[model samples]
Target: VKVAYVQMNPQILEPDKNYSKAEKLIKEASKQGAQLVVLPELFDTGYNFETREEVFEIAQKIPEGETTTFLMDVARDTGVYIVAGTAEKDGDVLYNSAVVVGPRGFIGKYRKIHLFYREKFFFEPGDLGFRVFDLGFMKVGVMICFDWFFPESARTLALKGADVIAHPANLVMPYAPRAMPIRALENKVYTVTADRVGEERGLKFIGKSLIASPKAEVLSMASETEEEVGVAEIDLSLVRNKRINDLNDIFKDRREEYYFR
Candidate 1:
């Protein structure tokens, strides 16, 4: 499978511009042979929210929102799967969420489980829990930016049979890409991290969108400041290879009872 990570710079609170840029990138990726494409976290509305009301105004209703409908159109039109992040407003509460859509239509959404820094103020901790979406081609797990900090997030998805972890991030920190290969190696799944680039308000986001294979290989990585679409070709069967030398099995040999005890 070929996956493309769309690393973009979204203007603060400008969902229109963000959507336009995302559409273009999606087309570019599809043209370049990407079967699945991912966009960065809070992509439609930039992060660094100053107030709850401000975010609520910019946030959209999932699947029904313009951003999602647009993604659905693109997905259906191109016959490619898409995973993109946006601020989601359900009733009066706001959550950072990513939606997964395919050629058929809307599939599922994954809310960010681990809130980071000031995220606690404007968004609720993810309520959807960890989930994996089966795209016929692969079983994909979705993890937003800060959720990557918690190893358990990926492990839970891996345990549930995720073949690829689609990571949407608006990262200001420098540690995630380095940590992703370990996440993939330990879980024996492919990981695609689509991070943003550009300065929002006063905060500068690092854009090193990358993909890591289960063999701990960096498939592709983008520049820190450039708008790029990094594509990686992954073998889906590698997700099931959990053997470490022949004596130890990564999952079957796990001492789960010890941790449970």
Candidate 2:
């Protein structure tokens, strides 16, 4: 299957423009034969919120909101799977969340379990935990920005039968590019990270969104300053081949019993 990652610039408080850009990018990716498309974290509302009131104004309910509704229709029309991040609101609580949708409609959402700098003031930590959604073509999982900091996040998804991990980020740090490949290598799964580019307020987002294979090879990558679409072909059968060689098996040889509790 082919997966495309959208690396674009999102403007704060400008959901309409952001949504339009995402729509255009999704269409482009679809035309290029992408069976699965991924967008960056808070793709419709840029990060670096100034206040609680700002957060409340921008956050929307799942699936029912304009951004997700548009994405759902797009997925249905293109017959492709889509994973996108958004500022989500449920009653008085707000969470950094990623939505998964396919031709069949809304599948599920994975909330950001680990909050990054400044996010703690505007969003609640995830309560839903790690989840994997069966997209028919592949078992997909999601992890937003800061969640990459925790090794357990990707490992949990892999253990739950996810073949691909769709990551959405507004990354400002340099470590994730180095760490994501390791995440894929250790778990022996595919990972696609769509990160935003350009500066927001004073925060500079260096986009280097990428797709990694089970062997930790980068299939496609966007530049630090370019808004681009990076697509990579992945085989789910390869995900199940977790053998290090004829003698050792990555998963089967696990010494879980001896691992620290």
Candidate 3:
């Protein structure tokens, strides 16, 4: 399938501007013949947590909110799967949520499992863990930015039959994209990470969005200054062809007696 990644600069809290730009990019990616497109984590509002007021003010719920509705329409219009993260209010608590949308409509959502720094302070700890989606043709798994730090998270998705692992992030450090290769290697699957760039509300979003194959090869990557859309075409046949099952198909044959934790 053809996959597209959007590297954008959000104008913190301005959902209109963010969605406006997202519309343009979505259209652009569609024109390029991409089956699935991914925007950065917390895309509707830029990632900034200098105060508690802003956090409470920007949080929202699923398709009940305009942003989610806009995304649903966006995906339906473009006929492409859309994956994005937003600051959401689930029940009485707040969460950093990521969702996937296909032609049939919104299909999956994953609340950020591993909150970073002030994230736990501003938002409640996610009751859930990393989640996966059945993208019809592909089993796509997703976790927000910080979730990439944990190998077990990605591995769990891999063991569950995730063909493509997509991450939406608002990164700040230099080594954000550096972890792609390792994740791909350990999981033995295709992985893609999309992050934002440019300064918003006094924070610099370091963008180094990238996609990697099960072979641990960096397929496509973006620069910190570029507000770009990158694409990569890969075949799923390669995944099964190269999957080292006999050597390490731990999921199929687990020795529960050996480690009864």
Candidate 4:
């Protein structure tokens, strides 16, 4: 599967402007014949827990909201699967969620399960577990921001029969880069991490959008600059041999007995 990862500076509380940027990038990526495109966390509104209510105003329900509707139309028009991070409004509650829109529309949603410091002030922890969606020939899972830190998160996806794990993060300055590679190696699955760039609430994000193959190798990565989109192709057959055939269901043989710790 050919996938494009978008790394950009999502303007704080500017959904209209960010939507424009995302649409343009989606068109550009589609022109290259990409199938799936994943964007940074809070691509619609910049990550701001304190002003979450302010940004929450921009949040919309799937398929009904303007942003989601726009993405759905784009996915239909371009025939490209669009998986983007957005502030989602479900009744009175808000979530740091990634919405996947395709021909079927709203294929998946994975809320931020692991909280980071004051992030809990705005969003609630996810009540649902990891979700796997069929990405044509491969199964894919979504991991948002802080959730990627816990090896169990990705391992859960890997054990759930997903060969690719995609993430949308809003990490900036002094952190992020070091943690991304660790998640890739530990899971032993095709990992794609799309991070935003630029400053937000005094944080300077050094964009390190990346794709790590099941070979435990870096496939492609984006620079620290904002307004960048990186693309990587996934060979679904590779994981089939390594994880399924050679390993003979190694993921299924997980040592659940280790939980004694």
Candidate 5:
């Protein structure tokens, strides 16, 4: 399957401009023969919310909201599946979330489990557990930016039979770019991390959006400062085999009894 990530700079509080840019890039990626495309965290509204009021004003409900509806249209038109990064509003509560849409319609959504920095002030911790959605051709799991810090997040998805982990991020720290590939390597699953570029409210987002193979190879990666789409073709079959060698299977050989002790 050919997967792609859009690494773009989203201007703060400008959802309209961000939507148009995301649409253009999603079309571009689809034209490039990408079957699955991922966007950065809060791709519509930029990160760094000053207050709960601002977050409430910008956040929208999933599946029925403008952002998900817009992405559904794009997915229907382009014949591609999209993992869209957006801020989700559920009544008075809010969460940093990723909505998944396919050619048919809404597949599912993943609320980000781990909140970063000041996100706690506005967004609730994710209520939905790690889930894997079947896209017919492959099974995919969703995780947002800060969730990458937890190895258990990826491991849970892998254990649940996720062939690919769709990661939407607004990364500020330097470690995730190097760490995610290890997540892929350890779980033997394809990981696509779509990270944003540019600075928002003094916090500079590091955009090294990447697609890592199960073997820990960096299949494709974007630059730290550029607004671009990174695409790579990967064999889904490689993800099914957890064997590092003839004798040992990564999952089968696990000493689960000692892991907690």
Candidate 6:
């Protein structure tokens, strides 16, 4: 399967403009034969909200909201699966979430389990545990920006049979770009991290979107300051084979009993 990550700058409080930019890039990725595409965290609404009220005002309900509807339409038109990075509102509460849509329409959603910096003030920590959706061709899982700090986030997904982990991030920190490939290596799973470029409010997001192979090789990486669509072809079979050598396997080598929970 060929997967792509979109690296673009989103303007704060401009959902309409963000959607247009996302749609154009998504179409471009599809035209390049990308079967699955991932976008940055809060791709529709730029990060760095000043107040919870601002976040609530921009957040939309998943599947029933405009963001998911727009993604479904694009997925239908492009014949590709999309992991939409958006802020989600569920009644009185809001969450950082990723909504998955495919050619068939809505598949599932994953809320960001680990909030970064000021996000804790506006969004609730994710209640839904790690989940993997079978996309007919492959199983995919999701993790948002700060979740990369917790190895358990990706490990749980990999344990649940996720062939590819879709990571949508608005990363301001320097560690994740280097850390995610190690996550891929340890889990023996593919990882596609789509990050944004440009500044929002006073904060600047580091772009460097990347696709890492099961063997920890960086298949493709975008520039730190460019708006790019990085694409890479991967074989799911490699993810299934977790063996490091003839006698050692990633999953089988786990010495669970000795480890502290």
- How close to the true structure is residue 232 of candidate 4, measured as C-alpha lDDT? 80
Write down the RMSD of candidate 6 (Cα, Å): 0.9
Give the least accurate 10-residue stretch of model 5, judged by summed lDDT.
Answer: 49-58
lDDT of 4 by residue, 142-245 (tens): 88887776778887887786777878888754455566556655556788888888887777777888888776677887888757777788887666543545
Report, for every candidate in turn, its global Cα lDDT versus the true structure: 0.91, 0.90, 0.81, 0.77, 0.92, 0.92
Which portions of model 6 show Cα errors greater than 4 Å?
Answer: none
lDDT order of candidates, best first? 5, 6, 1, 2, 3, 4
lDDT of 5: 0.92
The sequence of per-residue lDDT tens digits that candidate 1 reaches over residues 39-115 is: 99988988987888888987899989988898999998888899999999999899899999998899989999999
Report the C-alpha lDDT of model 6 over 55-140, residue by residue, as the tens digit.
Answer: 79878999899999999999999999999789999999999999999998999999998888899999899999998999989999
Q: lDDT tens digits, residues 1-261, model 2?
A: 899999999889889898889888988899999999999999887898889788688778997888778788989888889999999988998988999988888888888999998999988999999999987778888999988898899988998888999999999999999899999999999999999999888899979999999999999989999898988889888897778889987778988899768
Candidates 1 and 6: which is better by TM-score? 6
Error of 3 at 207 (Å): 0.7
Between prediction 3 and prediction 6, which has the larger TM-score? 6
Prediction 2 global C-alpha lDDT: 0.90
Write down the TM-score of every candidate. 0.97, 0.97, 0.92, 0.91, 0.98, 0.98
Clashing pairs in model 2?
A: none
| Model 2 bad stretches (over 4 Å) | none
Clashing pairs in 3: 60-89
Hey, what RMSD does candidate 2 come out at?
1.1
